[PDB]
Design a protein around this ligand. Sequence first.
Ligand SMILES: C=C(c1ccccc1)[C@@]12CC[C@H](OS(N)(=O)=O)[C@@H]1CC(CCCCCC)=C2c1ccccc1
Lengths: 11, 239
Amino acid sequence: NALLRYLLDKD
Amino acid sequence: SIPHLILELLKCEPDEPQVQAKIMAYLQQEQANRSKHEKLSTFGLMCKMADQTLFSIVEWARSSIFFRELKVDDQMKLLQNCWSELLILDHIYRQVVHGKEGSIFLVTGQQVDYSIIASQAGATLNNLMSHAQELVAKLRSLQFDQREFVCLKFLVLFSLDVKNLENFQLVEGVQEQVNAALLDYTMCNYPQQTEKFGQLLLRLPEIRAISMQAEEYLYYKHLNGDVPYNNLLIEMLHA
Ligand SMILES: C=C(c1ccccc1)[C@@]12CC[C@H](OS(N)(=O)=O)[C@@H]1CC(CCCCCC)=C2c1ccccc1
Protein backbone atom coordinates (compact mmCIF):
# COMPACT_ATOMS: atom_id res chain seq x y z
CA ASN A 1 0.00 0.00 0.00
CA ALA A 2 2.23 2.79 -1.30
CA LEU A 3 -0.48 5.41 -0.75
CA LEU A 4 -0.83 4.64 2.96
CA ARG A 5 2.95 4.65 3.38
CA TYR A 6 3.08 8.02 1.61
CA LEU A 7 0.41 9.56 3.85
CA LEU A 8 2.36 8.43 6.92
CA ASP A 9 5.74 9.68 5.63
CA LYS A 10 4.97 12.84 3.64
CA ASP A 11 6.34 16.07 5.07
CA SER B 1 -11.63 13.51 37.76
CA ILE B 2 -9.91 12.46 34.53
CA PRO B 3 -6.89 10.10 34.41
CA HIS B 4 -3.83 11.78 32.93
CA LEU B 5 -3.69 9.21 30.13
CA ILE B 6 -7.19 10.08 28.88
CA LEU B 7 -6.22 13.76 28.86
CA GLU B 8 -3.30 12.85 26.58
CA LEU B 9 -5.70 11.05 24.23
CA LEU B 10 -8.03 14.07 24.21
CA LYS B 11 -5.13 16.34 23.22
CA CYS B 12 -4.72 14.29 20.03
CA GLU B 13 -8.31 14.71 18.82
CA PRO B 14 -8.66 16.63 15.53
CA ASP B 15 -10.58 19.88 15.26
CA GLU B 16 -13.87 18.45 14.01
CA PRO B 17 -15.32 21.60 12.38
CA GLN B 18 -12.20 21.99 10.26
CA VAL B 19 -12.16 18.31 9.30
CA GLN B 20 -15.83 18.47 8.29
CA ALA B 21 -15.49 21.78 6.44
CA LYS B 22 -12.52 20.43 4.49
CA ILE B 23 -14.44 17.32 3.42
CA MET B 24 -17.54 19.37 2.57
CA ALA B 25 -15.44 21.67 0.39
CA TYR B 26 -13.71 18.77 -1.39
CA LEU B 27 -17.01 17.14 -2.35
CA GLN B 28 -18.49 20.43 -3.55
CA GLN B 29 -15.59 20.82 -5.98
CA GLU B 30 -16.02 17.29 -7.35
CA GLN B 31 -19.73 17.88 -7.96
CA ALA B 32 -18.96 21.17 -9.73
CA ASN B 33 -16.52 19.44 -12.08
CA ARG B 34 -19.12 16.83 -13.11
CA SER B 35 -21.35 17.62 -16.08
CA LYS B 36 -25.08 16.92 -16.51
CA HIS B 37 -24.59 13.40 -17.89
CA GLU B 38 -21.84 12.47 -15.41
CA LYS B 39 -24.29 11.83 -12.57
CA LEU B 40 -22.60 10.13 -9.63
CA SER B 41 -24.45 7.40 -7.76
CA THR B 42 -25.50 8.06 -4.18
CA PHE B 43 -23.42 5.01 -3.25
CA GLY B 44 -20.52 6.55 -5.16
CA LEU B 45 -20.87 9.82 -3.26
CA MET B 46 -20.71 7.96 0.05
CA CYS B 47 -17.57 6.15 -1.13
CA LYS B 48 -15.92 9.50 -1.88
CA MET B 49 -17.07 10.86 1.49
CA ALA B 50 -15.75 7.80 3.32
CA ASP B 51 -12.54 8.09 1.30
CA GLN B 52 -11.95 11.65 2.51
CA THR B 53 -12.78 10.62 6.08
CA LEU B 54 -10.02 8.01 5.84
CA PHE B 55 -7.47 10.69 4.93
CA SER B 56 -8.30 12.55 8.14
CA ILE B 57 -8.24 9.33 10.17
CA VAL B 58 -4.74 8.59 8.87
CA GLU B 59 -3.45 12.06 9.73
CA TRP B 60 -5.08 11.83 13.16
CA ALA B 61 -3.35 8.53 13.89
CA ARG B 62 -0.06 9.82 12.48
CA SER B 63 0.08 12.61 15.07
CA SER B 64 -1.34 10.66 18.01
CA ILE B 65 0.56 9.74 21.18
CA PHE B 66 2.05 6.21 21.11
CA PHE B 67 1.14 5.66 17.45
CA ARG B 68 3.80 8.17 16.38
CA GLU B 69 6.41 6.08 18.23
CA LEU B 70 5.85 3.12 15.89
CA LYS B 71 7.83 2.52 12.74
CA VAL B 72 5.89 3.11 9.54
CA ASP B 73 5.58 -0.62 8.82
CA ASP B 74 3.92 -1.15 12.20
CA GLN B 75 1.74 1.93 11.69
CA MET B 76 0.56 0.57 8.33
CA LYS B 77 -0.37 -2.81 9.81
CA LEU B 78 -2.42 -1.23 12.60
CA LEU B 79 -4.38 1.04 10.26
CA GLN B 80 -4.91 -1.76 7.74
CA ASN B 81 -6.49 -3.81 10.54
CA CYS B 82 -8.87 -1.18 11.96
CA TRP B 83 -9.60 1.42 9.26
CA SER B 84 -13.20 0.31 8.75
CA GLU B 85 -13.82 0.07 12.50
CA LEU B 86 -12.71 3.69 12.95
CA LEU B 87 -15.03 4.84 10.16
CA ILE B 88 -17.98 3.02 11.74
CA LEU B 89 -17.09 4.19 15.25
CA ASP B 90 -16.81 7.76 13.98
CA HIS B 91 -20.19 7.35 12.29
CA ILE B 92 -21.77 5.91 15.44
CA TYR B 93 -20.46 8.66 17.70
CA ARG B 94 -21.64 11.37 15.30
CA GLN B 95 -25.20 10.02 15.54
CA VAL B 96 -24.95 9.78 19.34
CA VAL B 97 -23.98 13.45 19.55
CA HIS B 98 -26.00 14.96 16.70
CA GLY B 99 -28.45 12.25 15.63
CA LYS B 100 -32.19 12.83 15.46
CA GLU B 101 -34.76 10.08 14.96
CA GLY B 102 -35.31 9.36 11.28
CA SER B 103 -32.19 11.16 10.01
CA ILE B 104 -28.49 10.47 9.50
CA PHE B 105 -25.74 13.05 10.05
CA LEU B 106 -22.85 12.81 7.61
CA VAL B 107 -19.24 13.85 8.15
CA THR B 108 -19.94 16.93 6.02
CA GLY B 109 -22.43 18.28 8.56
CA GLN B 110 -25.31 17.28 6.27
CA GLN B 111 -28.52 15.84 7.71
CA VAL B 112 -30.29 13.30 5.48
CA ASP B 113 -33.59 11.51 6.03
CA TYR B 114 -33.31 7.76 6.57
CA SER B 115 -36.27 7.10 4.26
CA ILE B 116 -34.25 8.72 1.47
CA ILE B 117 -31.10 6.75 2.29
CA ALA B 118 -32.90 3.45 2.89
CA SER B 119 -34.56 3.76 -0.51
CA GLN B 120 -31.13 3.84 -2.17
CA ALA B 121 -28.70 1.85 -0.03
CA GLY B 122 -29.98 -1.70 -0.63
CA ALA B 123 -30.73 -4.51 1.78
CA THR B 124 -27.18 -5.25 2.95
CA LEU B 125 -26.24 -1.65 3.77
CA ASN B 126 -29.69 -1.04 5.27
CA ASN B 127 -29.10 -4.06 7.53
CA LEU B 128 -25.64 -2.87 8.59
CA MET B 129 -26.87 0.68 9.16
CA SER B 130 -29.74 -0.65 11.28
CA HIS B 131 -27.29 -2.69 13.37
CA ALA B 132 -25.18 0.46 13.77
CA GLN B 133 -28.26 2.45 14.77
CA GLU B 134 -29.00 -0.11 17.49
CA LEU B 135 -25.53 0.61 18.90
CA VAL B 136 -26.30 4.35 18.71
CA ALA B 137 -29.44 4.00 20.84
CA LYS B 138 -27.59 1.72 23.26
CA LEU B 139 -24.69 4.16 23.61
CA ARG B 140 -27.04 7.14 23.97
CA SER B 141 -28.89 5.40 26.81
CA LEU B 142 -25.53 4.80 28.52
CA GLN B 143 -24.59 8.51 28.26
CA PHE B 144 -21.58 7.72 26.07
CA ASP B 145 -19.30 10.77 26.23
CA GLN B 146 -16.18 12.07 24.51
CA ARG B 147 -13.68 10.74 27.07
CA GLU B 148 -15.05 7.23 26.59
CA PHE B 149 -15.15 7.75 22.81
CA VAL B 150 -11.43 8.55 22.54
CA CYS B 151 -10.64 5.52 24.70
CA LEU B 152 -12.53 3.22 22.32
CA LYS B 153 -10.79 4.88 19.37
CA PHE B 154 -7.43 3.90 20.84
CA LEU B 155 -8.64 0.42 21.84
CA VAL B 156 -9.75 -0.06 18.22
CA LEU B 157 -6.51 1.34 16.80
CA PHE B 158 -4.21 -0.63 19.14
CA SER B 159 -5.75 -4.04 18.51
CA LEU B 160 -4.26 -7.27 19.83
CA ASP B 161 -5.52 -8.95 16.63
CA VAL B 162 -2.68 -7.38 14.60
CA LYS B 163 0.03 -9.91 13.73
CA ASN B 164 3.69 -9.54 12.75
CA LEU B 165 4.39 -6.27 14.57
CA GLU B 166 7.97 -5.33 15.40
CA ASN B 167 6.79 -3.66 18.61
CA PHE B 168 3.80 -5.74 19.74
CA GLN B 169 4.63 -4.84 23.34
CA LEU B 170 3.64 -1.20 22.83
CA VAL B 171 0.30 -2.24 21.32
CA GLU B 172 -0.24 -4.60 24.24
CA GLY B 173 0.77 -1.87 26.69
CA VAL B 174 -1.50 0.81 25.23
CA GLN B 175 -4.41 -1.64 25.09
CA GLU B 176 -3.86 -2.48 28.76
CA GLN B 177 -3.36 1.07 30.05
CA VAL B 178 -6.27 2.52 28.08
CA ASN B 179 -8.45 -0.26 29.50
CA ALA B 180 -7.36 0.58 33.05
CA ALA B 181 -7.93 4.28 32.36
CA LEU B 182 -11.42 3.65 30.99
CA LEU B 183 -12.23 1.38 33.94
CA ASP B 184 -11.03 4.16 36.26
CA TYR B 185 -12.84 6.94 34.39
CA THR B 186 -16.23 5.21 34.30
CA MET B 187 -15.99 4.29 37.99
CA CYS B 188 -15.27 7.88 39.05
CA ASN B 189 -17.64 9.77 36.73
CA TYR B 190 -20.55 7.29 36.49
CA PRO B 191 -20.35 5.53 39.87
CA GLN B 192 -23.98 4.36 39.75
CA GLN B 193 -23.70 2.70 36.31
CA THR B 194 -22.02 -0.59 37.19
CA GLU B 195 -22.73 -1.94 33.70
CA LYS B 196 -21.21 0.95 31.75
CA PHE B 197 -17.66 -0.38 31.41
CA GLY B 198 -18.78 -3.80 30.17
CA GLN B 199 -21.47 -2.39 27.89
CA LEU B 200 -18.87 -0.14 26.25
CA LEU B 201 -16.35 -2.94 25.73
CA LEU B 202 -19.09 -5.20 24.36
CA ARG B 203 -19.72 -2.70 21.55
CA LEU B 204 -16.22 -3.26 20.15
CA PRO B 205 -16.86 -6.84 18.91
CA GLU B 206 -20.16 -5.58 17.49
CA ILE B 207 -18.46 -2.65 15.76
CA ARG B 208 -15.78 -5.07 14.55
CA ALA B 209 -18.53 -7.31 13.14
CA ILE B 210 -20.37 -4.45 11.42
CA SER B 211 -17.14 -2.98 10.03
CA MET B 212 -15.74 -6.27 8.72
CA GLN B 213 -19.07 -7.13 7.07
CA ALA B 214 -19.10 -3.62 5.60
CA GLU B 215 -15.61 -4.14 4.18
CA GLU B 216 -16.69 -7.45 2.62
CA TYR B 217 -19.73 -5.76 1.07
CA LEU B 218 -17.66 -2.89 -0.35
CA TYR B 219 -15.12 -5.35 -1.76
CA TYR B 220 -18.06 -7.02 -3.50
CA LYS B 221 -19.22 -3.66 -4.85
CA HIS B 222 -15.70 -2.94 -6.11
CA LEU B 223 -15.40 -6.33 -7.82
CA ASN B 224 -18.84 -5.60 -9.29
CA GLY B 225 -17.63 -2.34 -10.86
CA ASP B 226 -19.56 0.06 -8.62
CA VAL B 227 -16.88 1.93 -6.64
CA PRO B 228 -15.37 5.19 -7.96
CA TYR B 229 -11.88 3.92 -8.72
CA ASN B 230 -8.38 4.92 -7.56
CA ASN B 231 -8.52 6.34 -4.05
CA LEU B 232 -7.49 5.50 -0.50
CA LEU B 233 -10.70 3.53 0.08
CA ILE B 234 -9.79 1.01 -2.61
CA GLU B 235 -6.20 0.70 -1.37
CA MET B 236 -7.36 -0.16 2.15
CA LEU B 237 -9.81 -2.75 0.81
CA HIS B 238 -7.18 -4.69 -1.13
CA ALA B 239 -4.35 -4.50 1.42
C1 LIG C 1 -18.72 2.34 5.46
C2 LIG C 1 -19.49 3.32 4.99
C3 LIG C 1 -19.73 3.39 3.49
C4 LIG C 1 -21.02 3.42 2.93
C5 LIG C 1 -21.25 3.48 1.55
C6 LIG C 1 -20.20 3.53 0.64
C7 LIG C 1 -18.91 3.51 1.17
C8 LIG C 1 -18.69 3.44 2.55
C9 LIG C 1 -20.13 4.33 6.01
C10 LIG C 1 -19.31 4.46 7.30
C11 LIG C 1 -19.42 5.91 7.75
C12 LIG C 1 -19.38 6.73 6.46
O1 LIG C 1 -19.92 8.01 6.61
S1 LIG C 1 -19.29 9.43 6.17
N1 LIG C 1 -19.13 9.33 4.55
O2 LIG C 1 -18.02 9.38 6.78
O3 LIG C 1 -20.17 10.47 6.50
C13 LIG C 1 -20.08 5.79 5.42
C14 LIG C 1 -21.53 6.20 5.12
C15 LIG C 1 -22.36 5.23 5.89
C16 LIG C 1 -23.85 5.55 6.01
C17 LIG C 1 -24.62 6.03 4.73
C18 LIG C 1 -24.60 5.05 3.52
C19 LIG C 1 -25.71 5.25 2.45
C20 LIG C 1 -25.43 4.60 1.06
C21 LIG C 1 -26.26 5.16 -0.10
C22 LIG C 1 -21.63 4.11 6.23
C23 LIG C 1 -22.16 2.96 7.07
C24 LIG C 1 -22.16 1.65 6.60
C25 LIG C 1 -22.63 0.58 7.36
C26 LIG C 1 -23.11 0.76 8.65
C27 LIG C 1 -23.11 2.06 9.14
C28 LIG C 1 -22.64 3.14 8.37
